[PDB]
């Protein structure tokens, strides 16, 4: 009966030295019942990455929606949408459904391809932008993620160090939440290569 915690799941994003990382777990459940172990919550539109936690039907719907909108954007503008711009589009689109919202906690991450700046942002279900230097957290284990991130994080981590830090924040937060876990994916994003790593974690 709380749509934001029927399916479960989490997303975390972090900035480093000339890089960003964004990670999610793979669980999709129906309350106590785990249903799928392959439900990824991170998508990309060109070089801009979007993670979405919350009600899985809305997660899927919003991905399909932002693919639609960024495809038309590209055709008309003749360039890939940038993270700062995509962030605004996410905000507009969610607030447009102000009194019948999508029950989601989106997170944007990527590098602006003109300025080279790493960029992350988070949103509430009705579109409020939370831009941050350091980290953004989302999902049913968000309290835990806030705790992990606030203690583990330090600025200017190298991509391979940032990887360890974001992974440890995700893993240990997931393990204190009954509705998150069942696998995890971490994206390390540099100006023009992106590595995707699947983490080994406890399957309970």
């Amino acid at each position: 009966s709380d749509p934001s915690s029927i399916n479960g799941g989490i997303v975390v994003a972090m900035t480093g030295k000339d890089c960003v990382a964004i990670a999610c777990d793979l669980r999709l459940g129906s309350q106590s019942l785990g249903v799928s172990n392959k439900f990824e919550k991170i998508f990309h539109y060109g070089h801009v990455f979007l993670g979405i936690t919350g009600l899985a039907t809305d997660v899927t719907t919003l991905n399909e929606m932002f693919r639609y909108k960024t495809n038309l954007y590209k055709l008309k503008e003749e360039r890939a949408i940038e993270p700062e711009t995509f962030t605004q589009l996410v905000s507009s689109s969610l607030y447009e459904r102000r009194f019948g919202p999508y029950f989601v906690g989106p997170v944007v991450a990527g590098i602006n391809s003109k300025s080279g700046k790493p960029f992350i942002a988070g949103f509430d279900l009705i579109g409020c932008i939370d831009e941050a230097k350091d980290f953004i957290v989302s999902g049913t284990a968000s309290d835990q993620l806030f705790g992990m991130c606030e203690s583990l994080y330090e600025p200017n981590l190298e991509p391979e160090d940032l990887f360890e830090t974001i992974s440890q924040a995700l893993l240990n937060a997931a393990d204190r939440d009954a509705l998150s876990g069942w696998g995890a994916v971490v994206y390390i994003i540099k100006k023009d290569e992106v590595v995707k790593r699947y983490l080994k974690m406890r399957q309970d």
């Binding site: 509430d124 279900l125 009705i126 409020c128």
Partner: peptide, 4 residues
């Protein structure tokens, strides 16, 4: 939804 967050408040201020």
């Amino acid at each position: 939804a967050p408040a201020x």
